[PDB]
Design a protein around this ligand. Structure first.
Ligand code: KVQ
Ligand code: KVQ
Ligand code: PLP
Ligand code: PLP
Lengths: 810, 810
């Protein structure tokens, strides 16, 4: 049908049909008379997986011959989403499979919709890991994603009476055709025990053994015939475990709990033992595998020439003491040689400055669970503080601040401190975030070792986030400038010579309108809801957080509503305001914000005076596959975090790529997005980092804003008095109370400038041609925000390897 | 190589090789350079499974068209063993696959050895279920095995210092290529709750839901292109289960525990709630499926014309009240019509008379877990006792004895009573066992309803138990009388015209000697043990039980040893005495007997005076796949249960078929084996049922035998004084104490006649020609003991269907 989906050759289509019927019969043991749409999805999945297999085997083979430096991306989260369309896109099979399925009387798009998201992540961080694996394969890096195969990923979100309910994400119920179990490479992981000191050094004994069983998932590069590996570990009890009889077998479930469930906290730390078990489990099994692969090339001087280990935040920080433990206790290297090897192997990406998100593990937990690691951590701390003392003699305060060990009621290990000490590179995830690291929380570490601190601004894969989710936009771009941009997104700048071309302006607006019609219909079908598709689609999709200020958005929506009620017969640009995201299940305030969003919707959507001029929709179960639908349908991207809180964001980039204008604060990658497009092509409002600091010094008094802004007082009096909760007048007293007395994120301080800036968005939306021209200027400058740029920067400036776009032979 | 293994056609072999290489590449994602023997086993498994798939689909299709009466075999146990060789045998692929694997440089026999037993059973009962499924498929019956997919089957037995240690049977670690998950036919099973009475009858409410997910395993018939289905249920939590968040997800394991582990008790009842949950789970999910399939043919008068349900002992007795509950509470049939349908649908096989094996469930357990079933059971009891009262007016004692409800400290339901009341047929499993049922424990039920009581003598499948385990014997038989006997074992009588043929006598002895050489070498390799293969192989393999009297065997072995020490320089027929079996983990006395067997071995095998004249071997981890090796190697079958305790036995039949002579009591199927071969071709000794009864009336005084038999006193003084346990002189005081004061199974009463009969075995073994002639007379009369005869009898006399040997088209 469309050019960027590849060729449907007569041979290819015939062969895809033969193999689809072979899998339906032999693999699924179904005839065509009893097959369900789900059997047809599986037969197709198996048929596309067959095209991966040769490439996967030849790629892993090639890495054995050439023995390049190996990259190990350690993450507790890989937010993969669906695999089928991504595989077809990257193998150029999409049109062939459309054709082959059409000739068997099936709709490929209907079968695509039956795939479960691999939801093994919370949001930005897990999804960055997935975009990275795609970019590492596209750039021919010998890269491995290592993590945990959670039985249950991020919970499925139901709304009941406007409240979030959680349901278990049973994503493996029907089987995962993408993974290959490798039970033959099962490795032991040790817990508890105690340290004995001998003549021959320290010895970790009386440990409980958990087995780590790997599942390999293929990661295809973009048409380069490279297939890298994501290895995920599953926890298994040994067969002698507890071995009255019955209970011993049932108690195997204590050990297997380690890989049962993803912790559903976004940008928050929960100090639970099961979480620390997950962190050690992935580090212990991964490092044995890394070392096994290295020894099949005694001499560990070459280890950092053959191995880069990237730590995705501090979640796998134990990789540092674990590598020391293996090198010192098992390989019998001296401390200093082992440490040199460790520092040159490890690098640490920091993702947040929020105090409540930084991992600070109580010493009593590490003492019980990982006694030897705690000894190695104390020893690291001693030798690290001795270097601080020598460089800053007499600065005892620096020594207390830089310590890996925090003093207090409970002693904690600062895992971030451990990562900086044990890594040759520390990077933030956007320029402003990397600057904030050097000026604030890591100032001391920066003054000791300025050379370690880098920026690597985040990116998104234009494969999933343009070609796959927005084929119509991909196509009209390819019509003008060819296909090369999909693996070289900087080529999108060539679109600037088309901002005054009438046909291109018409095609960009037509794709946007088609995406909106398609998404409005998706809402009708799956959730019986009626939206005007000629309205401005104002979309805020991201995890529910105080710092991301969904509440600021709520205040704008109630402001629009109050303005309609006051002057009902005046023209307003119509809007569908859509807010979606999950709250962490124990995050009371995030759960109240969801409830307020739905409560606003219950009042606004049923007011006859409002008409189809204002709709408020809570998008249920926001996840990777809902993002692929709603991002392409959006007109306005809401990126309205308080300046200095959103380290980068990646949602922002997705919408820039897909033809939405951004209303945002000078926070995270928003700053670099505005720099690339021009400030005049961006709806920037609100405090800078500098202004928030000025407010903090004098004191944030919310009362002042409530007293000076009559429009804001009206909203607060409405919230307080039960305008939005008639049967429960005090339902939202916690929200009012927090906004008035304990707002860390200064929602009221940005209110006036937000509402005024939202009027400028409406004004431009009245002028379709100038809206679409500004959209073109955004799409055209979105190249920097490709994960291909990000990974090429990690590769050249951290890992010491050269990316490549050269194809492996088929 | 050998004729009964089928043709290796040039096309067949080429095609098996192509598909083996296709599965190694596409299915296992291995090249030939990294593949292990286990990858080669899997590629072959997948290649043979592909030949099942067409036949399976066409068979299930054919049953939908023809809509024959359906047989449902409900068992908590299917002792399947390995599937690969069985599939090849029944599809005539064995020589083709040998040839195809040989040409790829692999040894098929080495790959066969890598398959895990499906050990979803304890022994005789579970293995009867497996032999039955094979015979039902061979006789073209529309039959379904229904059970539980236990994650852990019968434990792996290790011996440490002569003691049994249990290890978890992780049989699914590497995957099961034989099963097909059918998550789309998942059914709810209810537990707990309470009964509400309405206008519209009774209603079971506030229940906990467990999901039952079926796994289908193919059951190929012998070269008739029939493939029946074994459906096993797996327990799954619903996604709203417990739905702080983390614990709710981890607590899903409470529901999934139902199908986690097989209870490892043989011929013993443990009244545990988890066991009752397993019993309801398989019955609830199976009956919904049975009814679903019936409704795709309102009118339940025809139900028993379309459905037979066979209960394998009382383990699925809840099928009776469950069928009533569905018919009365859900389908709104009146009680009497529902009961008529239930009785005509259900039939009950009894397997034991041992009091401690009969299921008697406390009322308080049924009250809490299955409140509605208990109400239906009380109602059954009332209407049943009203018929007893009418037929036997004034016999209040009969009423107490026949009650489904036993009075006492705790009230119990007698599940056997429920089965007789709710079934149109009750059968024992050997003629003497069926007679004992009518004269003793079910006398009262027999006098009320004589027409219900049948015999169906057990059998074994000659496919697994001759062709598969003993190809050399199968072949020399096929040389003389053709192949037809494999599906018509009565044809073995034709071998009687060869008892005086010298070539046949030579070939029978050569196969036996080859089997013994092959088994002696298996012992050397896997367990570093050195046996004389010219010795008589005296084999007792079965679960470790007081009633099966391994101890009587021990007494003979110590007698032989004491006779050698007294007269070292006199000739004795050399023997390898091999005893093997598992003890139930909580069965203290069974665990002590294993320890005594190994303790005898430690003394006997290390005495230089004894030489290679007497060896005692404990065969570790006795299971279906060890039975396929040791049964063909045996000279003497030990079937020495106390008369009236072994309902049938099936081991006995396996050895008769495979060229071993039997030393046994007139117990179980031993009686009919002796009748078929002639008493003169059988080593019968000991008390009959009549003699045990005579001893019971006067009182069993073990002292009397100890006082009169000096040889026996010597053994007891040796056991007591620590002759067999030097460092622990009192190790075996429990064994001596039980034999002297509390022996329910009268070991000493059979001792004298056992030792004298064992001398007659030795005498005949000195005369190879007359031993082999007696062996021929045994093999020749073993036809009755085919499970094909058994199932044809169930079919004609219980289920009301005609067996068929006609092929489905390929
Ligand atoms: O770099 C990827 C994204 O990382 C987000 C983040 C920071 S900390 C964090 C986290 C996620 C799960 C469990 C614990 C912490 N996620 C962070 O909040 C986003 O700004 C950023 O875009
Ligand atoms: O009919 C098959 C075999 O059944 C054996 C049996 C009786 S009761 C029983 C059992 C097995 C497992 C759990 C509970 C009871 N097995 C019984 O002990 C054998 O004699 C007989 O051959
Ligand atoms: C990209 C993405 C995110 C991250 O969005 P932010 O706006 O940067 O928080 C979260 N969830 C999903 C499903 C995503 O695709
Ligand atoms: C046949 C068989 C049994 C039953 O043997 P009995 O001697 O009748 O108790 C038990 N276990 C296995 C593995 C069998 O094959």
């Amino acid at each position: 049908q469309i050019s960027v989906r590849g060729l449907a050759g007569v041979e290819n289509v015939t062969e895809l049909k033969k193999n689809f019927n072979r899998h339906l019969h032999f693999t699924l043991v179904k005839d065509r008379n009893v097959a369900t749409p789900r059997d047809y999805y599986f037969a197709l999945a198996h048929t596309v997986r067959d095209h991966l297999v040769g490439r996967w085997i030849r790629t892993q083979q090639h890495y054995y011959e050439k023995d390049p430096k190996r990259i190990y991306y350690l993450s507790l989260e890989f937010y993969m989403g669906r695999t089928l369309q991504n595989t077809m896109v990257n193998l150029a099979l999409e049109n062939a499979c459309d054709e082959a399925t059409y000739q068997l009387g099936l709709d490929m798009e209907e079968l695509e919709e039956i795939e479960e998201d691999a939801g093994l992540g919370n949001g930005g961080l897990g999804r960055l890991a997935a975009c990275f694996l795609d970019s590492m394969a596209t750039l021919g890096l010998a890269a491995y994603g290592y993590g945990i195969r959670y039985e249950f990923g991020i919970f499925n979100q139901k709304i009941c009476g406007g409240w979030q309910m959680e349901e278990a994400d049973d994503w493996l119920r029907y089987g995962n055709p993408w993974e290959k179990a490798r039970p033959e490479f099962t490795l032991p992981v040790h817990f508890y025990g105690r340290v004995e000191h001998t003549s021959q050094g320290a010895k970790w004994v009386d440990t409980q053994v958990v087995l780590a069983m790997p599942y390999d998932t293929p990661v295809p590069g973009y048409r380069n015939n490279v297939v890298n590996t994501m290895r995920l570990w599953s926890a298994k009890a040994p067969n002698d475990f507890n071995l009255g009889y019955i209970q011993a077998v049932l108690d195997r479930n204590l050990a297997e709990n380690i890989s049962r469930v993803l912790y559903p906290n976004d940008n928050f730390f929960e100090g639970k033992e099961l979480r620390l078990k997950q962190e050690y489990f992935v580090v212990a099994a991964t490092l044995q595998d890394i070392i096994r692969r290295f020894k099949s090339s005694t001499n560990f001087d070459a280890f950092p020439d053959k191995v880069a280990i990237q730590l995705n935040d501090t979640h796998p920080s134990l990789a540092i003491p674990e590598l020391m433990r293996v090198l010192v206790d098992l390989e019998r290297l001296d401390w200093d040689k082992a440490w040199e090897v460790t520092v040159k192997t490890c690098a640490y990406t920091n993702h947040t400055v929020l105090p409540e998100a930084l991992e600070r593990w109580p010493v009593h937990l590490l003492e019980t669970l990982l006694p030897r690691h705690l000894q190695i951590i104390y020893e690291i701390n001693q030798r690290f503080l001795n270097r601080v003392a020598a460089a800053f003699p007499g600065d005892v305060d620096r020594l207390r601040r830089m310590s890996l060990v925090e003093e207090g009621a409970v002693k904690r290990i600062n895992m971030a401190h451990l990562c900086i000490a044990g890594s040759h590179a520390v990077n933030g995830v956007a320029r402003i975030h990397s600057e904030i690291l050097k000026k604030t929380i890591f100032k001391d570490f920066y003054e000791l070792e300025p050379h370690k601190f880098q920026n690597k601004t985040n990116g998104i894969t234009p494969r999933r986030w343009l070609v796959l989710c927005n084929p119509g936009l991909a196509e009209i771009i390819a019509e003008r400038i060819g296909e090369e941009y999909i693996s070289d997104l900087d080529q999108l700048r060539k679109l600037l010579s088309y901002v005054d071309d009438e046909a291109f302006i018409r095609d960009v607006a037509k794709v946007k309108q088609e995406n909106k019609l398609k998404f409005a219909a998706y809402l009708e079908r799956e959730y019986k809801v009626h939206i005007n598709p000629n309205s401005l689609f104002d979309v805020q999709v991201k995890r529910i957080h105080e710092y991301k200020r969904q509440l600021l958005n709520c205040l704008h929506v109630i402001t629009l509503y109050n303005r309609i009620k006051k002057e009902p017969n005046k023209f307003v640009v119509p809007r569908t305001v859509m807010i979606g995201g999950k709250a962490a299940p124990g995050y009371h305030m995030a759960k109240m914000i969801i409830k307020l969003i739905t409560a606003i919707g219950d009042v606004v959507n049923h007011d006859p005076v409002v008409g189809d001029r204002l709709r408020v929709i809570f998008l249920e179960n926001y996840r990777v596959s809902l993002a692929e639908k709603v991002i392409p349908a959006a007109d306005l991207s809401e990126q309205i975090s308080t300046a200095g809180t959103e380290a980068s964001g990646t949602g922002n980039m997705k919408f820039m790529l897909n033809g939405a204008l951004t209303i945002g604060t000078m926070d995270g990658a928003n700053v670099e997005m505005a720099e690339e497009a021009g400030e005049e092509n961006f709806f920037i409002f609100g405090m800078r980092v500098e202004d928030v600091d000025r407010l903090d010094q004098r004191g944030y008094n919310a009362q002042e804003y409530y007293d000076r802004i009559p429009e804001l007082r009206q909203i607060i009096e409405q919230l307080s008095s039960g305008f939005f909760s008639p049967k429960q007048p005090d339902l939202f007293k916690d929200i009012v109370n927090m906004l008035m007395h304990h707002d860390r994120f200064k929602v009221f301080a940005d209110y006036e400038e937000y509402v005024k800036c939202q009027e400028r968005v409406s004004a431009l939306y009245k002028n379709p041609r100038e809206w679409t021209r500004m959209v073109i200027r955004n799409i055209a400058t979105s190249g920097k925000f490709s994960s291909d740029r990000t990974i090429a920067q990690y590769a050249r400036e951290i890992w010491g390897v050269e990316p490549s776009r050269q194809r492996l032979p088929a």
